[model samples]
Target: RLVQVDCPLGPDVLLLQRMEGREELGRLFAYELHLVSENPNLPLEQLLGKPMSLSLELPGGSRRFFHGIVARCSQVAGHGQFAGYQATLRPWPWLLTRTSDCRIFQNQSVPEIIKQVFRNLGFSDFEDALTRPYREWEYCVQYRETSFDFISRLMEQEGIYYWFRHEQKRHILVLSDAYGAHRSPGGYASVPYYPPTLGHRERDHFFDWQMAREVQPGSLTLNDYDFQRPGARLEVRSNIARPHAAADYPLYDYPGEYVQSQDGEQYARNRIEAIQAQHERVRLRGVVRGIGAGHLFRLSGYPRDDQNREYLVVGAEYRVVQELSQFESELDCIDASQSFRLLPQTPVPVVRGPQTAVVVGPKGEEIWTDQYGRVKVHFHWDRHDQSNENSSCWIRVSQAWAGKNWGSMQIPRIGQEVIVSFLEGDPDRPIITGRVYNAEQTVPYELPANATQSGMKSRSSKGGTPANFNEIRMEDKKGAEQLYIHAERNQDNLVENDASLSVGHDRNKSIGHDELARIGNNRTRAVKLNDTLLVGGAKSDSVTGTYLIEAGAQIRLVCGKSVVEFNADGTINISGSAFNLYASGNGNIDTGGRLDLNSGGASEVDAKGKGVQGTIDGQVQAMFPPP
Candidate 1:
């Protein structure tokens, strides 16, 4: 409501537009009102000495408006006779949209310009403004089948009043009478909404993803991916600040409070719900402040006590997932069974978003990321049965050229291979690197029966087996050779008794035929860990430790906590997982079966967990771990 202030003695006039600031309306009326405030009103002159109050309502805006001078007069304020004069100044020309009959100035005629514009569009009917006083001729580009709309859109961009035509309706291209009234010249409105203020940081995240769904729908979504070699990667940033990602997260400034049960937590929960309906992969990104040894935020894939919360994340999340390809597996090692242990990792990092979580792998890969081009996050192939033998594979694309080849493809028939190769000279392009295993294809393995029968053995390894024994002969061809096993006589010369077997060339005496041995040593089929090692019930508990068991060794590890560390000192194959096991090899970590990070007491802190907590009061210091 524009208050046309009808000052009882002064020029009762002031205008206001809904939501529009007082400044803009000032521009349109300043010139006209300034003159009227000073000059004499003809109607007032007729009244001579009587004063009266007058008021009326009028439309708020004018088009292609330039300030015009109506008069230059002044008023005297004093105790005038009676009600004096409310200056019955009325709003002239009720909604004078057409400039015809409106006097702007003497030298320029509004109709002449209209004539010129008409001529340009093959029109000739228009009146001149300079010659005809108070004469105005409205000019509008004819509604035609052309690019006039686009041209006018440019006019709006230039802040010039122009118009466009669609379906025969003459739409004047002006700044929206206000902001939401967006159909202006440039597909832009006079008002551009400013991002609203968020009371807490997390609330922003909830709505940010809502925007990806609501604002950039259909084909106008974000783009492709990129890859990082194991232990090789980088974080990317955008020029424009995505306020929502940081909306829930204000600058730590000096760091005081670390955790808050904010409404923002719902954003992450909602995302998890969105993911539950079907398979999904998401990449969320945001900045992480003060991450260390013991933070209040703990995460696991499932709900636990305060020890670790799998659901509530702690940062901005731009959750997205692999859409093009099946998440690929990286080979950790080859087991005795010639089976490969694949370590699967997600490329998309949900650093922060509607939720606040920066995921770390069980082995401590601390990170938070958005599945943007630098990481190329994709979907989990939700609509189709991924378990189908003939499922097609795809790789979501992005600017990263680290992969050899990235395109939608089909897996080979049973028993076929997936070979990835880079482009001719571009080592950056990644190619195929996988296999299509046949349902019945068997993995290779080696056993204990393959150990060497005649070599002198070394001292016993801590918990390792079979290396303490050697065979001794009396330097004669016919003497019986005795098998010897050694161990430290722990004090007082005390010794335990156990029958030992002579591992010789005799197939009956030993576990395997001597012919299959590599020269005279055992052949666990080239020695790999992938060979199946089934732990048979409780009896298998005795065989839980590092061992030098030769080829064809059928050992089981009933104690899931026991570990079998395989080193790449040489090649070794394993057909089973180091179940509840720990492996420390220089080359790679492999497990043919599930490498579950099962806990002894729920939370197994290796020295300590991945994060340490510290409060930001005055200074930054680590108080928990001894200095």
Candidate 2:
């Protein structure tokens, strides 16, 4: 049979009348088949999503198979008494286009992530033959994008490509990077080109061969910034030049989406190679049934020496007709000497605007931050994360002000809701732009009632209670305006030069404990009017030098019934119930006017070994000798 099909349906049930399809590297293959069946009414349910394969007999008795799942099928008008049907075949990975997700993958390489995605969807028909090393992504997000697009863009960025290896029962997706991942088909490793005017029906070969070349940029330059090493030069360039003039044009791009200079260099090389892959291409029309994309074959009979070299088939379109017993293919191939790179065609997902995420940390941490005040966050759309520090990269937080060694700073504590924005709308570069309150983390003060109050309140670290916080609040209520400050612990005020405090009205100070004041120099206190001091307990005053007390009017020392008064009017008084005076050395009493002495109870004069004399108006009134 010129064409044969194997399906879940019984044998000889459906006959392949015609088929047309296209396959390309790093892309899904699609085949549209026109078949006829004896039954007029064939159920579409039996074909959709079912695996099927078509086999075409080659000239050397080998068969080339095209296998895929019937993604779409429909009944068409009859073809000469047989019911006609049209079916579209696609590989298993194509089904990923139907499913979208919002998820995150951490610390996984691109190959690992792609395999995981495939395994998650219950697919295992994939082989990894990658040669180059892929960097492990610290954080990757599939936000509101299809699984196909997510993986496709990742593979493209990493210079990875894939093609299908067809079998009678299944088709395996072969992931490749270098030329070692490809092989030549049996009996068709080398194909000959023949002129159309001279028909050669005895053997299958290419008839029409054409080659083309175009000018492409010779160099690619990529630059990126790494916050950890801001001063490090991360700019890298890759160049591939041709002999043609103006081929040395350069392509420069910022934010190459990598942090390391080595990675940037590799990316630049891949991009330039991809751009230059189109510089040299060959288009061929062949009847060789075994020719397929991603396969290596040599041109045996081309006239040009360079054109006769080995080529890697990059893409192909096939057409087959059972009635005419005909098979044809148009293939696009490039020189096997050059590497193949997938064109960056997939649209990268961009975060449209700012999103809210919750700050996260370790099991018992209240705040997690780096030296740069960067924090980790669990995006709201991420369902696969544990909402821990490992959920994301260290994202920088925006503060009121940023300076060198001095600026306003407020680290986002764990479980706090923060407004996150992407730099350049790139999900990989998230920054905490602001913070907000939620139902659980409500406002510090009751709203509306205390709406007039505004200030900053901070909780003490490492297991602090709500009451254990420092706050500086201002109340703007009319007539009751006030500025209040609370120190959770000790507060120190230092003044190098001078400090001043002025109160508009009465000032009251209450200290829970004793206060100590130390003055470097003399302290002088003056009261405009009366000064009153009340001491609850005994008080002692000590002076290093002389202690002096003076009054403008009178100076009085009074205790109980004792009194000693010195009046400014030149008068003095001394009185007490009992008075006694002792002289350690000698005691002298002199008065300018009159001196009077009297005792209430008893009066006695006793001289010890001395004589006592009283003189009045130059006459001796009394004299007493010691006895």
What Cα-based lDDT does every candidate model obtain? 0.23, 0.87
Estimate TM-scores for all models. 0.14, 0.93
Q: Write the per-residue lDDT of candidate 2 for residues 67-117, one digit (tens) a residue.
A: 999999989876567888888999999999999999878899999999999
Candidate 1 on 106-218: residue-level lDDT in tens? 12223343334345444322122121122221211111112233222222221222111111112121121111221222211111111225333421121111111111111
lDDT minimum window of 10 residues, candidate 2:
609-618
lDDT winner: 2
lDDT of 1 at 33: 27
RMSD versus native structure for model 2: 10.0
